[PDB]
Amino acid sequence: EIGASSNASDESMIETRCVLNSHSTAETTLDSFFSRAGLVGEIDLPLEGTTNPNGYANWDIDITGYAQMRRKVELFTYMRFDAEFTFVACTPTGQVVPQ
Amino acid sequence: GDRVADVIESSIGDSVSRALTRALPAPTGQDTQVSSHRLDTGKVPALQAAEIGASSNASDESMIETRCVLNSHSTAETTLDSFFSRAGLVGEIDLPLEGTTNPNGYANWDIDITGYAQMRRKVELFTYMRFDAEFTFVACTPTGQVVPQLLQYMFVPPGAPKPDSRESLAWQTATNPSVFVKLSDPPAQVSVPFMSPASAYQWFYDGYPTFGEHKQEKDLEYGACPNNMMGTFSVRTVGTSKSKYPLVIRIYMRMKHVRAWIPRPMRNQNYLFKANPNYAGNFIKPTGASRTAITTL
Amino acid sequence: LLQYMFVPPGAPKPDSRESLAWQTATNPSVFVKLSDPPAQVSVPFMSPA
Amino acid sequence: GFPTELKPGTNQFLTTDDGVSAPILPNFHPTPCIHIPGEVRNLLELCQVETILEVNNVPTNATSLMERLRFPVSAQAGKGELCAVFRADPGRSGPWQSTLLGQLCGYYTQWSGSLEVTFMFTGSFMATGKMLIAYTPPGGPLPKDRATAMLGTHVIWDFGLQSSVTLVIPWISNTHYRAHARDGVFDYYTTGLVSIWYQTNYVVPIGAPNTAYIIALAAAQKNFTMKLCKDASDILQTGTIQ
Amino acid sequence: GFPTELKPGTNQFLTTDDGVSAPILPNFHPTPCIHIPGEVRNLLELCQVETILEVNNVPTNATSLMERLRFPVSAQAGKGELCAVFRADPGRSGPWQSTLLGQLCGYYTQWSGSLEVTFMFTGSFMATGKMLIAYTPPGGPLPKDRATAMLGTHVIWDFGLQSSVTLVIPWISNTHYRAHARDGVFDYYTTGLVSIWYQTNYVVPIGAPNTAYIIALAAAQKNFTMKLCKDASDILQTGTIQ
Amino acid sequence: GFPTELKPGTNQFLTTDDGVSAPILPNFHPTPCIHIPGEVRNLLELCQV
Amino acid sequence: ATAMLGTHVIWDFGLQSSVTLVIPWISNTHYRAHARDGVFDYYTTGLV
Amino acid sequence: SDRVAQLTIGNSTITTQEAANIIVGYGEWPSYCSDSDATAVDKPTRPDVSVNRFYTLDTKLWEKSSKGWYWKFPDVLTETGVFGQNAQFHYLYRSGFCIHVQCNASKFHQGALLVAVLPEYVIGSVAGGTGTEDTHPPYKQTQPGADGFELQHPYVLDAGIPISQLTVCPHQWINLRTNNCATIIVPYINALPFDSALNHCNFGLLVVPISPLDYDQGATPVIPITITLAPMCSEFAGLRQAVTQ
Amino acid sequence: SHENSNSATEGSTINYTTINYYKDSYAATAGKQSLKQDPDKFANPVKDIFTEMAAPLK
Amino acid sequence: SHENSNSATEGSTINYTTINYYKDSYAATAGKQSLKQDPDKFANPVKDIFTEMAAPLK
Ligand SMILES: CCCCCCCCCCCCC/C=C/[C@H](O)[C@H](N)CO
Ligand SMILES: CCCCCCCCCCCCC/C=C/[C@H](O)[C@H](N)CO
């Protein structure tokens, strides 16, 4: 009712033994959870098409276009961070071309 | 409190593991000391009893007249890391253009090193092994030619969504670690930690993972250790359309920081199934070669 | 893409391009492409003498 | 002309690799950080906050999706009947998916630590009663009756001024960590079952409602840890987000 | 812009090369290691454990593969006849392939150190006798008789309360190491021959079995070392492991 | 991500270049050297015979 | 299989001809009255 | 001073006059789980004398044509006494063992038994002989119970592993000419501090006659092999209702 | 090592270990965070804190 | 050199010499192990150890 999580411990409910917990909590930190590159935008540069037939495309920077990234980032209201952007370019067949 | 003698003097709770032996440094092979002819009664090093189950401790000096040899032969190369830290084939992924296995341009490889006898016989020598891993992915066409194709290797831990198509949403890799390399580049190489829930990988699990009746349909669960299911390996050709080239991907694993427990007899029969000690019942062959007679070579 | 395997005396000699000996689970192997610079390794003094 | 030799692993793009990248804007100083309350530093802080546990996750229609949050109790025949059961796995599909703890554990393959479940009684002040909440360690099937259920870890809940009671699910496992359990061979990592039985009855006087609802809140203790960060099990996206 | 010059050997994948690789899971801490008994630290520990030596490796059929482990002795004519012979090479095809020492030495090109072979007598308690076990250093052919065999290293075995005797095969070689010997020019690294001759007879009283079996256990001494780790001589695989 | 710039002379194989190469056999210790008479140390020793 | 569950000894024939089986004092009361058929079997010592 | 021995634990005592010393598995005595190794938070129960006692489970007859037998641990005791009751009522399990194999004969009998303890002894099937059939051993073969199971191909131990290398495991030899008993003390061997006593079998005990039994006609033809064993430092945790299998 | 103090976490009470090769601190690696947690600041954010073993409502 | 202590052989009595360029210790090289052996713990694991030159069975 108060709105506070119950503070009852294991020792105060059942007969417990002595366990030295050495399990690290490092991997649940913010940088460990978030510092993994994920898709945030995709740019298509077709030869003949209606989207970008001019050989260029302007992508308004926003990470809300893909649910995988959006669900993670949207967990918190305010986020302050640096960014590292990697651009993987290839033809639709996955082939690399001298462009 | 404790007032009765059987509780006060009780050894219950003594968690120290009494070890009759202690490890001693041995950088080189043991030296051979001078020995002379020895003619005495009552004391006899030659006669032993393998009945006890202990290896005979008779030395060279106690059997024949030996000289003094300073043995400087190093024992470094027989250590666990020296023996195991050599990359070997553990899995092969085929990505055909037209086929029945993986015609969709992607393939999910359940991570297991039991698919190749060369690696399996080495790793299966010990019951429990704890180590890091270093995986190298050599990709090429069936003719051995390198082609300008961009691939994605995804590590899919147990419980993560397995991709079902080359354009599946799971490839967004927002949380899973992924590697993007081209075939023209050197083979991709990453280091994988010890991810088992147990304190050590166990190649043989003499038990069942879940309770209940183990009928015919629920019979493949024997010998399967969930503590060794490290996840799935997903590879795809990065693109929306079908790839121009057929690809075959070979995955080489090299253990490091290896620790091993409980040595067991080395396999002597042909392997038949992954994660299964089954052997050809009618084709049981002897461990070594045979000879016509025991009195001749 | 080529594979160079060092086969010490006593190790099984491969008999075909798809032989099981190429699994190199113990033997040292080098995987290089012709476009890459020539493969270069250092070999110790391995003679019994 | 310093001699270097490229080793395998070059030219690759590893998404989890922590490396250095060229800064696009030299000499750029970001906006100074003012103090904002409620800063998180570890996801374990969020994993220790109680959230509503959808124990009664039977309904599916939109007009009654709200009743999944709580399950009812009422006057009974006093034979120790069963009220509700649910598995104790947080990252497994089921009731625990409604909790923030379960949602976060969906991002981590392995978890270790004792969980805590608090049930809030929302009945009238004049309604009393006792309920038995029992946790069955792994290996034992669903208890057939209260006499079988009492043999495991359990708590006796007495309705009173203190509306809620806390049931601690102790960390009882053979392995240091539990991988995510599911149907098949991976049920080896099951945590067990939590069953709620009527201890005596739900006693209510004349003039008060005959049916009362219980709200279950689930959270993790201070020894709870997570390992092997993995991809999300659910992708909240059907096509392209337009 | 640090000037570097790539030297030959780049872009290659050396399977035995010890290098650094990018960690897939940052900040991941593995499961803590509990104490497990029987940890190995060096393969020499396994090479010093006695294992059954298939001296009588004549049979091939499945129903009698078990009799390869032991070879028989019986009452004889007392002329010092020959009982069994076998080569002392551990990594060579033959009896030594049944031993863990031989199986491990199959993984190493060069070995150096004295070997030890213990024969366990499994006859009746009332049966006595003496046997001569002689080791012939390299260069000498198979001895034609006991008089020739005694000239090399040998031990006289007396049956008694101590069932087994230990024959030490001393390290006698011109080279510091022996490469794996086989038929052809590589027989230069032969270790020699071990032959077992009846010293006096196998004497047994009335009412006890006339034929008794001997179990041979082989192992390596504390000066045994191995070098030049190589690929396995046998590949336990016919097709693809399905 | 240490910035390096390749200078001319890369990818070449110089036969007289003294460089480091990856060892094929890790932790391998060669056979110990016994004393052998008549060791040469410089070709000038042979040029004076 | 049922008998082994109580106090027991394993006797090996050898040079030592005899073995000693100790019947420990296991009783609820400090003393045992003389047991016999009927209600007085309450003081039974057990079976060997 | 080494041939006569007496092992006492709990309320049971086992004696022997032709012993052949005692083998401690991997040179480590059984011990209770340390607080830095334990992972369960509930306080384990340590019944002590009620479970740490010598259980005589079954008797097998050694014959001139016997192939060998094996038992699974603690399967053999999952249904025996207070130990079995505790193993059924408790989810977790931890204990050592002291296995005493009895096989007594006369001075005119001959034969040799290899008594070994192989941890995680996974039994495989014959795969239909040719090896094209993906079979699995039945429940009665993977968990034989207190009756053990007779090996079909003792040369490969029904698992593709030669018995010639079985001596690398803690083992003793029962050679009827000298000794009539084998004593092996096995600590807890697992990758986990605790495990289920029903689903998981920590190790399997193998009794395979390497040298066939022989005797002239007229002597006692029944040579029984009796297995006697006693858990050491047994712990249990995770109590719930009893589970039979 | 004189670089710009322009990382996203500058002016904080916590120390990181990062690798950087440029004058701008925001180009550095992610590094290691401090393992400090404040679970109570969400779990029990009450004005008058109450004892565990006692009655929450008195 | 402040890195994570997450190698597979951490908390051991033996010292390794490894080369690492990342904050995770399991990415390091294999390095050199200590040449410690315990041959007796398999070869002669008896309770009452017996002298070499004496009679094993007395
Ligand atoms: C090569 C230059 C790349 C420049 C990268 C700049 C990225 C800056 C990081 C944050 C970008 C904003 C992410 C989206 C924020 C909000 O969710 C949306 N604006 C919603 O309106
Ligand atoms: C790029 C990501 C690669 C991830 C590599 C993870 C490998 C983890 C190492 C151990 C893998 C398990 C090996 C096989 C274990 C057992 O033998 C089988 N599971 C038998 O069931």
Residue numbers in the entry:
A (entry chain A): 51 to 149
B (entry chain A): 1 to 297
C (entry chain A): 150 to 198
D (entry chain C), E (entry chain C): 1 to 242
F (entry chain C): 1 to 49
G (entry chain C): 147 to 194
H (entry chain B): 10 to 254
I (entry chain D), J (entry chain D): 12 to 69
What does the primary publication say about this deposited structure?
Enteroviruses particles are composed of single-strand RNA (virion RNA) genomes encapsulated by an icosahedral capsid of ~30 nm in diameter. In this study, we genetically perturb this equilibrium in a non-enveloped virus, enterovirus A71 to determine its structural basis. We isolate a single-point mutation variant with increased particle thermotolerance and decreased efficiency of cell entry. Using cryo-electron microscopy and molecular dynamics simulations, we determine that the thermostable native particles have acquired an expanded conformation that results in a significant increase in protein dynamics.
To understand how structural changes during the uncoating process are altered by the K162E mutation, purified capsid of WT and K162E were examined by cryogenic electron microscopy (cryo-EM). The native state of the WT particle was refined to a resolution of 3.3 Å using the gold-standard Fourier shell correlation cutoff of 0.143. The reconstructed WT particle had a high degree of cross-correlation (score of 0.883) when compared to the previously reported EV-A71 native structure (EMDB ID: 20766). We observed classic “jelly-roll” beta-barrels formed by VP1, VP2, and VP3. Within that structure, we observed electron density corresponding to tightly packed lipid moiety, known as “pocket factor”. The pocket factor in the WT particle interacts directly with the VP1 beta-barrel. Lysine 162 in VP1, well resolved in the density map, does not appear to interact with nearby residues. Instead, the positively charged side chain is exposed at the surface of the particle, near the exit site of the pocket factor. The exit site of the pocket factor is near K162, but the pocket-factor and K162 do not directly interact. A side view of the WT structure reveals a tight interaction of the extended VP4 with the internal surface of the capsomer and the external surface of the RNA (VP4 in yellow and RNA in orange).
